[PDB]
Each structure stands twice: as structure tokens, then as C-alpha cells.
Amino acid sequence: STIQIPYTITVNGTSQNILSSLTFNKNQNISYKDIENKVKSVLYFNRGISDIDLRLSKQAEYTVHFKNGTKRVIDLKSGIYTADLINTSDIKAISVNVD
Ligand code: NA
Ligand code: NA
Numbered sequence: 373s374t375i376q377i378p379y380t381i382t383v384n385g386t387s388q389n390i391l392s393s394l395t396f397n398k399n400q401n402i403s404y405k406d407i408e409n410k411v412k413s414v415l416y417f418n419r420g421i422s423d424i425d426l427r428l429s430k431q432a433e434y435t436v437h438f439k440n441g442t443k444r445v446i447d448l449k450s451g452i453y454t455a456d457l458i459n460t461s462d463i464k465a466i467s468v469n470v471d
Contacts, residue, residue: 373398379411379466383419392418394466401457404446407436411448411468421470432470439464 376393394410396402411434415421426432432448439462446452448470 375460377460377463377466379414379468381415381419381468381470383421383470396460396463399459399461401459403457404436404444404452404454407434407466408446408448408452411466415468415470419470426470430471432468434466434468436463437465437467438462 374395375398377396378391378393380390380392392414394414396410412423412426415426426448429449434446434448436444436446436458438444438458444458
């Protein structure tokens with residue numbers, strides 16, 4: 373009843389094509405706040421980037437890449453106010469960039 377959604381994290385750059393993914397429930401509507409929590413978890417455990425490191429970064433975002441070719445960029449240092457939910461099975465991949 374779960375699926376993997378691939379993700380990548382850019383902090384200072386790697387020379388690798390890392391095949392990492394996050395576990396989500398299949399075909400479930402979720403919020404951008406839910407995704408933000410999962411992004412924060414992998415930032416900490418994979419890269420040692422804590423919430424305080426995000427507070428002290430000049431810019432940070434994650435981007436949801438949809439299967440239809442469109443994207444939504446979420447600013448990790450700003451509030452999330454949309455009520456829109458998105459379906460996990462419509463998501464192709466998630467990218468994260470922290471400065
Ligand atoms: Na990278
Ligand atoms: Na913003």
C-alpha cells in the first residue's frame with residue numbers, strides 16, 4: 373500500500389546520481405506541509421541539515437515534479453497557506469536545494 377517517490381538533495385553538490393527515494397502511501401492526497409516534514413527528515417539524516425541550519429540558510433526550497441511535467445516550488449523558509457492537497461501517485465520526483 374506504499375510507493376517510493378525519488379528525491380535528490382543539492383547542498384554543496386555531489387558527483388553521483390543517487391537513487392534515493394521516500395516512502396509514501398499509494399494514491400493518497402497529502403499536503404505540502406506533510407511533504408515538508410519528510411524533506412526535513414531526509415535533510416537531517418542524509419546531510420546533517422537541521423531546522424536551525426535551514427533557519428540560518430539564505431535560501432532553501434523543495435520542488436515537487438508532477439508526472440504531467442509541471443512543478444510546484446515550496447519555499448522552506450516561508451509559510452504554507454494553500455489548502456490544496458496533491459496526490460502521491462501524481463508525483464514523479466522531489467528535488468531539494470539548500471544554500
Ligand atoms: Na547533489
Ligand atoms: Na517565498
